[PDB]
Amino acid sequence: LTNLVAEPFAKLEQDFGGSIGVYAMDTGSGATVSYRAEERFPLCSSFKGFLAAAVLARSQQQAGLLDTPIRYGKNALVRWSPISEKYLTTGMTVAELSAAAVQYSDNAAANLLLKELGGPAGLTAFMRSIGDTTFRLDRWELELNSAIPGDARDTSSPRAVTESLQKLTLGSALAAPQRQQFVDWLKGNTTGNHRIRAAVPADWAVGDKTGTCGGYGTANDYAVVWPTGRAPIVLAVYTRAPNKDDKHSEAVIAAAARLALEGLGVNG
Numbered sequence: 007l008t009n010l011v012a013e014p015f016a017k018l019e020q021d022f023g024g025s026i027g028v029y030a031m032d033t034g035s036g037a038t039v040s041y042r043a044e045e046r047f048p049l050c051s052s053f054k055g056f057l058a059a060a061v062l063a064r065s066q067q068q069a070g071l072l073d074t075p076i077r078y079g080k081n082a083l084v085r086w087s088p089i090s091e092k093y094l095t096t097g098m099t100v101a102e103l104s105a106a107a108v109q110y111s112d113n114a115a116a117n118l119l120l121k122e123l124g125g126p127a128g129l130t131a132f133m134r135s136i137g138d139t140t141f142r143l144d145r146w147e148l149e150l151n152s153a154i155p156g157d158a159r160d161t162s163s164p165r166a167v168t169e170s171l172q173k174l175t176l177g178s179a180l181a182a183p184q185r186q187q188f189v190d191w192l193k194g195n196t197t198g199n200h201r202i203r204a205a206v207p208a209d210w211a212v213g214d215k216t217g218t219c220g221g222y223g224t225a226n227d228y229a230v231v232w233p234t235g236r237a238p239i240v241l242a243v244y245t246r247a248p249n250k251d252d253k254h255s256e257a258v259i260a261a262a263a264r265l266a267l268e269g270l271g272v273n274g
């Protein structure tokens with residue numbers, strides 16, 4: 007049921023000037039669209055969705071975790087910490103840090119939560135526990151964004167991202183209350199309006215998490231999409247490019263998402 011209908015991904019990535027990786031699954035039928043789906047791409051900020059899921063998994067055994075207040079110093083505030091910079095003098099709860107990491111891609115929040123889990127290896131361990139053998143987080147923010155060609159650090163594949171996203175948002179990897187909280191955080195993301203969401207009709211629910219490394223044309227988005235009247239679709243779109251100064255393209259990500267939905271026969 008993979009690639010029953012061919013779509014012009016090669017032309018798209020040639021127009022972009024790099025590589026595009028796509029994996030999309032119709033959870034009703036199991037039909038899939040797959041293009042470079044098992045290649046590694048840098049995660050960039052997109053690890054923060056899985057980070058929040060790992061926090062929620064821990065909260066299943068720690069009823070007080072989400073409302074625990076976390077104070078932090080000015081040295082925690084790295085580039086692009088738009089929420090946590092406004093609460094430097096007060097602190098925020100674990101749940102607020104999680105929401106900020108997901109919905110505003112807040113870098114200081116992500117590092118604080120990584121510390122709670124035992125660092126990149128602790129998040130990687132959570133991903134292993136749900137059956138993901140591809141994901142690896144190796145470094146903290148901001149070092150994880152280097153996006154070096156051929157470097158497997160801080161990467162996954164579009165397929166493994168989609169499979170893990172499906173387990174966490176629709177499957178049984180989280181308990182039902184935590185699953186719905188993860189979905190609600192993704193639905194409230196503010197950074198993805200020009201990526202997968204731009205390919206999705208406004209009357210369909212979407213949750214997503216973006217990433218943009220800042221070099222090597224490297225940027226991405228993954229999402230769960232609920233078309234009305236049919237089963238949800240899960241998909242991931244990742245990009246990279248050969249030159250350090252190559253720019254990312256939001257339009258290419260939206261275009262790739264459109265081709266994925268077309269390949270699944272989903273009328274938008």
Ligand SMILES: *C(=O)N1C[C@H](NOS(=O)(=O)O)CC[C@H]1C(=O)NC1CCNCC1
Nearest residue numbers: 050051085086111151197216217218220
């Ligand atoms: C994530 O990849 N981020 C965090 C933030 N939001 O972008 S998004 O695409 O996740 O929404 C800014 C870009 C990126 C990031 O952390 N970039 C680093 C800091 C800015 N200079 C380049 C590296």
